[PDB]
Ligand binder design. Structure first.
Ligand SMILES: NC(=O)c1ccc(O)cc1
Length: 340
């Protein structure tokens, strides 16, 4: 690549490694914040809109219950998530502002992105046009170029994890499965529709799984549904490993060609994992109209700007039962989470 890209990535890695080696810890506490509204909820945590009581700034606070993290075998994953997030810096990654823990929970306080998840917008519109999908895809390509150069695999690409910001650009969130990996890794994780064949088949896999997932995402953005759908995961997995994909007739020939090379079941032949690396993707005809530098610099006008009233507006997120943030009087799982 141009020396300009090499030097950019060398500096990116220098800065990442310094923070990776000496992570920040314990940079706020719960009673610095007011709770506003639950924005999302899962099996071991939830994300809440909060407001800092002294500055008035809004943030999204991810709260993980230490005991449930342990029960669901997510200890290392949660430690990965925080250690990576506090060390990365890129225009399309949600910024971690504070982290801390208490007797019961782990907390990651992030910039609040009021536009909501791409998932909502995609389902509301139906599908994105190719230019619209391409604008988002280009951001993911650059983000993966960045992450992979740091030896990071993301492992959870899907529309729910892509927030739309006030300029209409992507912020990737949820580093719960992200990991620093030189070579291969083995954990079964991800969402079924987005899993590469080599994950399903229990292989030692690498960053090529992220490029497969990009193929799934581009297909889903442009079609409105993912390429390997079914009612049971096992039936999804059979389709994924089959080597067959059908494309809507409205897809351009260039889109189909790119997707055949991303959704390549032989990981040794998959775009993003060949000798030319990311440049096989960036130079593909489907991306011929993309000005990569202008995307990075946020100079391209976005396909749309989410509608929201201000930094406290939660309209683009949905409604969940509001549950307590209870902190035990006794420390739980202290040893397991020492480094957090
Ligand atoms: N950073 C955010 O605004 C955010 C919002 C909802 C989530 O589920 C995760 C993150």
């Amino acid at each position: 690549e141009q020396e300009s890209v090499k030097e950019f990535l060398a500096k990116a890695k220098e800065e990442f490694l310094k923070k990776w080696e000496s992570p920040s810890q314990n940079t706020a506490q719960l009673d610095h914040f007011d709770r506003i509204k639950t924005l999302g909820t899962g099996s071991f945590g939830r994300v809440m809109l909060v407001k800092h009581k002294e500055t008035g700034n809004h943030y999204a606070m991810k709260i993980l219950d230490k005991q449930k993290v342990v029960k669901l075998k997510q200890i290392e994953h949660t430690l990965n998530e925080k250690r990576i997030l506090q060390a990365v810096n890129f225009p399309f990654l949600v910024k971690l502002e504070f982290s801390f823990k208490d007797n019961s929970n782990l907390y990651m306080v992030m910039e609040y992105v009021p536009g909501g998840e791409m998932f909502s917008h995609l389902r509301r519109i139906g599908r994105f046009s190719e230019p619209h999908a391409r604008f988002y895809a280009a951001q993911i390509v650059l983000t993966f170029e960045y992450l992979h150069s740091l030896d990071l695999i993301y492992r959870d690409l899907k529309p729910e994890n892509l927030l739309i910001d006030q300029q209409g650009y992507i912020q990737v969130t949820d580093f719960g499965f992200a990991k620093r990996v030189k070579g291969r890794t083995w954990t079964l994780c991800g969402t079924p529709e987005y899993l590469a064949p080599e994950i399903i088949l229990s292989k030692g896999y690498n960053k090529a799984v992220d490029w497969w997932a990009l193929g799934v995402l581009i297909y889903e953005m442009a079609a409105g549904y993912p390429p390997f759908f079914a009612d049971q995961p096992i039936q999804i997995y059979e389709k994924i490993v089959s080597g067959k994909v059908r494309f809507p007739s409205h897809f351009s020939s260039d889109l189909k060609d790119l997707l055949r090379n991303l959704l390549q079941v032989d990981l040794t032949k998959r775009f993003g994992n060949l000798k030319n690396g990311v440049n096989d993707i960036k130079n593909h005809k489907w991306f011929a109209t993309t000005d990569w530098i202008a995307i990075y610099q946020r100079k391209v006008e976005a396909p749309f700007i989410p509608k929201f009233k201000g930094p406290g507006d939660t309209s683009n997120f949905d409604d969940y039962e509001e549950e307590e943030i209870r902190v035990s009087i006794n420390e739980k799982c202290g040893k397991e989470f020492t480094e957090f």
